[PDB]
Symmetry: D2
Subunit: 247 residues, 4 copies
């Protein structure tokens, strides 16, 4: 049974990915930062449908917690075949001229540094250079990497631009080691994330901006993530897959 | 009966692999070819022997009356299409820009670009919910060359593929309210006959060391990306450019 | 006195580039397709300001006319140092489902083929492989190459996408031969082109969509063209320089 | 009188070349440095000896209080800035991702990314017409790495520069009505020989990058905002 670790697996895109991955036969490590109840609910659904899963707490911005999380996965599920770097946050609407260092630090440490750290630990386990059997990593970026989120969260957009470049660089770096590395760029998706930044109606309000005239679902994003993870995408690496309704 | 897919240049290579895979997924397949009827017939035979439905349809996609007749044949014999794969395409001999003739350019663009526009036109007319269709999906076959430029080899080909990338984005945005998705795959160096057709039969092997994954791709690997994009799992994906390149 | 050939130099961006190039010390060949009066007026203005210039007729889609034009430039001005591939057209507003082959043929033969043909002739003269002293080529692309002109002229956008990739390919191809090749991507510019496609108010109507909230001037595009041509851009080749007000 | 430009990391390399060129164009130049006061003083000496105005200003751009103090110094001694070049930046030793530490990442991003955000914040506050300013221009210094990814060398650096590209675009669009333009230059391999991985077969010079920076800063680039200008020899 291949093992997949999903950071921020407890809600939204991460939860939809967890559920779909399990339907495809992965054992799933569902990471959460504090919402144990949500993570337990994803695990419950997986198990009730006949799959294997484990909820694992860690703040991906904390190196010791990332290490412990991977050790737990090693011990309880086995060596991972797949990693989804989904953990990520927005913040309140801001202009750059209102940005604090503390805001930037948080934005980048979760969205960017967490993805580097989880990828480090994944590569160490996966790479054929270390006797691993290879694997697949999907980073969750955003259309914002291309659009810049002006007047909303240019910092978030920049963090996602870092993720796009990271994706390409890491892909090239491990391409001989049996590892593929890709990113999905979701557009406006129906999740709690918009409410977390003070804009609970954002999916509805911005739908007229999207060429397809609706927000996307978490499940739609999960489909792209799980495709990239799997063997049907065996010559795809360094790809940036837009899931945006045309945005 | 089931959903219908028209695959231009379906007789060989990436097109043929896509035709076989699409049929496995339940599509009825129109396998277009320009001249190699035997190859097309063989793809059709394989599909039918596995219980699928397929028809071989001759057309040079650079010829308007032939594109129209091809769509009319599909309409009559298979039904209203749900999907189009604009795969037909060609390379030409190694050249620098300073050696390019107008005749070469005309050929390169009329097959690789004009053909894809004409076929998309006819597909949209049938698929669009504005015209009483039920929507559909179009996949254009681009290339990594669209990003890289094929210097000293075929900058004209690469430019034709750059046009396809932009056409993909423009058309996707234009028909997004009409139940149609439009996406492109960008293959890298793939094991097909195309390299031999331009005088470089060993190109897949020779260029493999340049690819981060250190091998050429297979037509089946490109077909997988094509068929994924065509299907309902890619339901919020439109205007995407999906690299199938081993990192190149 | 370095010699520059400007395709479609009689009006709009081409004319602005011609006037600016002359101010910088180029002798200018002002190409036109049929508006001899406009070309003669640009030449008159150049000469009045102390520069050298010649009007030269040619439809860039016609190989024989491109050859005759370069031969005239050779004879009357001397061997070119610089080429601006500016000649270009739009057409009426259309959807793809309304596009005819005849429209496509025109769009591409002027916007794409003409650029390749003029580049071919320029390279034959400029390349150090053939005993030339190098040179610089600027192609005029568009923001449409990135945005796609949906519901307006996807065919035009696609032609400009071809130009972007042509720019990169050709730049890489001739990089050791003393030749730089770059592209400017203008946004919405105040010229006659919008009227030629049946939308005379387009610069004004689309301005609210542009982040800077106005259309650009032909002079603003000419500044970028002439910078890329000259020696201050000596390490810049294969670049796509957006002149779009943020669009 | 003279427009004022603040150049972060102005004491050496691209920043120093930009300082010298900007002065030749008539800017008064604030030359920022983190610790190499001697180099910064030398740039200032050259500017002044050629008849320009300049001031060396110490600040670690990753430190908010130091960024604030620096802008306050420029306000007091040179006047309200018209231009900002976010050039301060570092690489680190060659590494794979599987060898990257959090401490490395923290440094890489705080200097290359957070410093650029903080300096742009303070610049926008002074420049924006919405606060009574007269507008201005910001050039960020990115890298070809933003597109290429620096595999097996420094993916972290490449990622930081990718952040700068998106920041550029986002900020440009955010302040476009406020008289502010925001652009980036993406240098390739720049010398401190044949350079075989560059199409042009040589490294670029700091002066070549400075030329592009100063062009973008000036009024000839008046409809250019959100652009990414490659100075890479085709890389
Ligand atoms: N419109 C969209 O939704 C949209 C668009 C573009 C990109 N994205 C990206 O999609 C990804 C998922 O977003 P979503 O909308 O599904 O978000 P969501 O509904 O807010 O779910 C967030 C998930 O991330 C977890 N998380 C947050 N900070 C963490 C940390 N420091 N360490 C570990 N886990 C952490 C949360 O854990 P708890 O449950 O424990 O809180 C939760 O499981 C994110 O990377 C986001 O940037 C979303
Ligand atoms: N490395 C690669 O192979 C590679 C990489 C990037 C992109 N691509 C692109 O992928 C697509 C498929 O290439 P491939 O390598 O599979 O090529 P191929 O093996 O050379 O097959 C070409 C197919 O296109 C058809 N065709 C050629 N001209 C046509 C026309 N005017 N009208 C209708 N059909 C026509 C052929 O019909 P006949 O059978 O009748 O000859 C054949 O079915 C092309 O668009 C190509 O540019 C390929
Ligand atoms: N908003 C914009 O204006 C905008 C935006 C993006 C890109 N562009 C691009 O910028 C370039 C200039 O456009 P514009 O707005 O300056 O155009 P314009 O004002 O319509 O000027 C057209 C110029 O091109 C010439 N021309 C047309 N067809 C030609 C042919 N077949 N051979 C040679 N010359 C020909 C005209 O010659 P005659 O005078 O003899 O007619 C005239 O000199 C084009 O490539 C256009 O696509 C414009
Ligand atoms: N091949 C290339 O050079 C190349 C390629 C791509 C991008 N770039 C980019 O070009 C820019 C300039 O690089 P360079 O090679 O010209 O740099 P350099 O020669 O290494 O000089 C670096 C400058 O940045 C300053 N600096 C470093 N850390 C700082 C901090 N925390 N706060 C404030 N200032 C700081 C230094 O101050 P001190 O003098 O006091 O130490 C110095 O003035 C950078 O953003 C770099 O990433 C260069």
């Amino acid at each position: 049974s291949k093992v997949v670790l999903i950071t921020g697996g407890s809600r939204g895109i991460g939860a939809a990915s967890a559920l779909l991955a399990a339907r495809q036969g992965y054992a799933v490590a569902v990471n959460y930062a504090s919402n144990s109840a949500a993570a337990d609910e994803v695990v419950r659904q997986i198990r009730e449908a006949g799959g294997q899963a484990l909820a694992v707490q860690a703040d991906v911005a904390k190196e010791r917690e990332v290490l412990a999380m991977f050790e737990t996965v090693d011990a309880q599920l086995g060596r991972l075949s797949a990693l989804v770097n989904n953990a990520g946050v927005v913040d309140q609407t801001t202009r750059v001229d209102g940005i604090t260092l503390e805001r930037l630090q948080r934005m980048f440490e979760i969205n960017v540094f967490g993805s580097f750290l989880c990828a480090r630990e994944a590569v160490k386990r996966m790479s054929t250079r270390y006797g691993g059997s290879g694997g697949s990593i999907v980073n969750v970026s955003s259309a914002a990497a291309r659009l810049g989120s002006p007047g909303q969260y240019v910092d978030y957009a920049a963090a996602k631009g870092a993720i796009d470049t990271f994706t390409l660089g890491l892909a090239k770096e491990v391409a001989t080691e049996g590892i593929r590395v890709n990113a999905v760029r979701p557009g406006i998706i129906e999740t709690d994330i918009h409410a977390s930044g003070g804009l609970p109606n954002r999916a509805r309000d911005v739908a007229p901006q999207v060429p397809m005239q609706r927000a996307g679902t978490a499940r739609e994003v999960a489909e792209a993530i799980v495709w990239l993870l799997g063997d049907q995408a065996s010559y795809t690496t360094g790809a940036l897959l837009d899931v945006t309704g045309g945005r």
